[PDB]
Design a protein around this ligand. Structure first.
Ligand SMILES: CC(C)(COP(=O)(O)OP(=O)(O)OC[C@H]1O[C@@H](n2cnc3c(N)ncnc32)[C@H](O)[C@@H]1OP(=O)(O)O)[C@@H](O)C(=O)NCCC(=O)NCCSC(=O)CC1=CCC=CCO1
Ligand SMILES: CC(C)(COP(=O)(O)OP(=O)(O)OC[C@H]1O[C@@H](n2cnc3c(N)ncnc32)[C@H](O)[C@@H]1OP(=O)(O)O)[C@@H](O)C(=O)NCCC(=O)NCCSC(=O)CC1=CCC=CCO1
Ligand SMILES: CC(C)(COP(=O)(O)OP(=O)(O)OC[C@H]1O[C@@H](n2cnc3c(N)ncnc32)[C@H](O)[C@@H]1OP(=O)(O)O)[C@@H](O)C(=O)NCCC(=O)NCCSC(=O)CC1=CCC=CCO1
Lengths: 245, 245, 245
């Protein structure tokens, strides 16, 4: 239901109900939560890559039969990952499927992938963080339209809006996604984690508080081995070798 | 001063001081407030459509006319509508005229319509929610330029920035706007209303609080007839028929 | 280390360690703070223009040179300037160099200028307000990519993202920047200042609080000579002449 697989410091997670377009059930949420918590705790894992099996990323909640609490746990786990997350959207992302996709720090879609909010078509509001992420990602103007009218957006339109950072031919998506994940897995994991904490908080903070948090987290980044390594690397005009500590 | 008219669940409100380009006065604000309160309370109204009479949408505050509290009341009523609002910008929107236009959830402009913040040219700051809406809609970088330099944007540029969602020839604007409003008036009114409550709050909330509010409001959407209808519709591969409750 | 120079109500500040690409040291920060405080207090100054000497704007923290409180003081002073700030990016802006550049209310880059977040390359998080400004300026999607991958962006890409408002040939940059600064120096300084206070706060405020602050600050703008002048100018179809009070 969630396939796992490690590779050069990258934990690859695959949503696996392909015949139902990876539609989301309680069980899948429970398994997804577990994989994410495992990936967080495993120190050998320095990057995650999330994708779907088959033709789709995920068509969202399975409309074949508490549940809210389950989604929320996954989102707290996705958002709080102290490790870069790459998302490879290999096909349709609808409803909470789109929500999950959008939690990637770096996001790639296949030519032929698509995105639809879908919630409103079922008389529901956006969940799994979409009301949070979407206006931040594409701006309020596009958020309003995408949410209220629920159009189906193509990969190329998703790229233009900032829903994804790169579009790639289907057969190359995993190769590029994994290649990016591997590179991130070599990079300064602590700097990544703390930069993400700043981005997650930025909009609700006053400048004063933003400056204070930057100070505190810069303080911590400053005492990592990776920063020592980083400065040394720059001085001795060579690439750094980061360990994530 | 504010024309009203119902049609298939849509309340159409027209700013009507056309010879003064629908420039805004205390009286017009008072009439607008009343129409909006009525529209909110009327259960047979499932969508609103706001437009201007004549050449212009609105040239903003009438410069030939405490008072700020009056604008604010109208904005609380505009923004808090528990019903999709369509805006059809039939000509120039300047100052609080632009503020009002931008409160549409879905916004259409006529080909020769135009937008100017105007405020700074009169030595004023933005009002009527523009300092709120604009940076959210188009991002801080464009907000700074639009506000501090007050250029005049065309319909096509407004479309590119997300200030409007669709551009249409003048003579077709009302037909398309009303047609959109009628379609929204058939859709899940509660889902629309609650989505808007989430969008209004999103930027000041931490992820944790955002997830909590999504849960509460999803809880309520979940107990509407429209959601039952929504799920049933998907199962029995047919279009849903929503009532807004 | 910081060159100063007045001209038609514009204070021009130049970062001057050109041989080290205007890399930032404690001393430079202290000198920059002083110049900014002076510019703030001088009533004859109605605009600032910040630039770099030589090939670069600033390559960020000098890696040859807790300390965060020093940067923060400068940022509080930059952000709280009650006067439009123009920034002319004449060459590379990296790390806190990019942070400082982005505090411009209006920003110009030379053809040939470039931008790099840089922080993550040395295993650090963004500072000097970049985690605050960047997501606001270009949206969260681009912020994620710019910060985590630290690409070097060209002037034209920076323009497309909103990092700068205008790109100009190198030999004309100062002429255009100063010309813009001079125009702003003739405009309604108080309206500028108060608009900036609204923009700085907007994201963490509820609509209700945003409307209240607009009322309070509009109240103040309303009692300036410049507003009287502004209204008078519109009535007597002529350009206003503003004094900034
Ligand atoms: C765009 C998409 C996802 C894909 O369309 P196509 O590419 O055209 O494929 P298809 O629809 O033709 O069908 C593929 C098969 O998979 C099935 N399927 C495709 N989604 C589903 C599905 N969500 N369920 C069951 N079978 C499905 C579908 O029934 C089909 O089986 P069958 O036709 O053989 O019976 C399409 O099916 C669609 O528009 N909607 C379905 C997805 C959808 O609306 N999800 C929103 C659910 S709400 C949500 O995200 C979160 C949520 C959170 C919390 C609390 C409460 C409620 O909701
Ligand atoms: C671009 C626009 C809107 C229209 O351009 P044109 O198509 O060129 O028309 P026009 O300028 O030639 O004027 C047409 C007629 O309507 C009148 N009008 C055209 N705006 C106006 C107008 N805001 N007032 C009166 N008559 C007007 C104008 O004087 C003319 O009347 P007349 O020919 O009967 O003399 C133009 O009038 C303009 O540049 N500026 C007016 C916009 C403006 O400054 N709005 C107020 C900004 S501040 C705000 O919104 C709210 C506010 C609220 C509360 C408290 C304090 C302060 O502010
Ligand atoms: C893209 C850029 C800026 C430009 O590269 P190029 O155009 O290829 O020129 P270049 O690298 O050859 O530089 C020319 C000279 O200036 C020197 N320089 C050029 N930046 C520097 C420099 N940041 N430092 C010393 N010498 C430099 C550099 O060593 C060179 O001298 P050399 O001939 O002795 O090698 C490149 O240097 C780059 O990717 N990164 C350098 C900038 C950088 O890493 N900034 C880190 C900012 S960290 C921050 O903002 C705040 C901070 C706050 C608090 C506490 C701890 C740490 O950090």
């Amino acid at each position: 239901m969630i396939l796992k697989e490690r590779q050069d410091g990258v934990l690859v997670l695959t949503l696996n109900r392909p015949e139902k377009l990876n539609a989301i059930t309680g069980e899948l949420l429970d398994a997804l939560y577990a994989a994410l918590k495992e990936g967080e705790e495993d120190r050998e894992v320095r990057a995650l890559l999330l994708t779907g099996a088959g033709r789709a990323f995920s068509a969202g909640q399975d409309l074949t039969e508490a549940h809210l609490r389950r989604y929320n746990r996954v989102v707290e786990a996705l958002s709080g990952l102290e490790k870069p997350l790459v998302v490879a959207v290999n096909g349709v992302a609808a409803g909470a499927g789109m929500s999950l996709a959008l939690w990637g720090d770096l996001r790639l879609a296949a030519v032929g992938a698509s995105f639809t909010t879908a919630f409103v078509r079922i008389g529901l509001v956006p969940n799994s963080g979409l009301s949070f992420l979407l206006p931040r990602l594409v701006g309020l103007a596009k958020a309003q339209e995408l949410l209220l009218l629920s159009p189906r957006l193509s990969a190329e339109e998703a790229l233009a809006l900032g829903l994804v950072h790169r579009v790639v031919p289907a057969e190359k998506l995993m190769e590029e996604a994994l290649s990016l994940a591997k590179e991130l897995a070599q990079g300064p994991t602590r700097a990544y984690a703390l930069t993400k904490k700043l981005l997650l908080e930025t909009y609700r903070l006053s400048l004063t508080e933003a400056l204070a948090l930057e100070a505190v987290l810069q303080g911590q980044a400053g005492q990592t081995q990776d920063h020592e390594e980083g400065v040394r690397a720059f001085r001795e005009k060579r690439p750094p070798r980061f360990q994530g500590r």
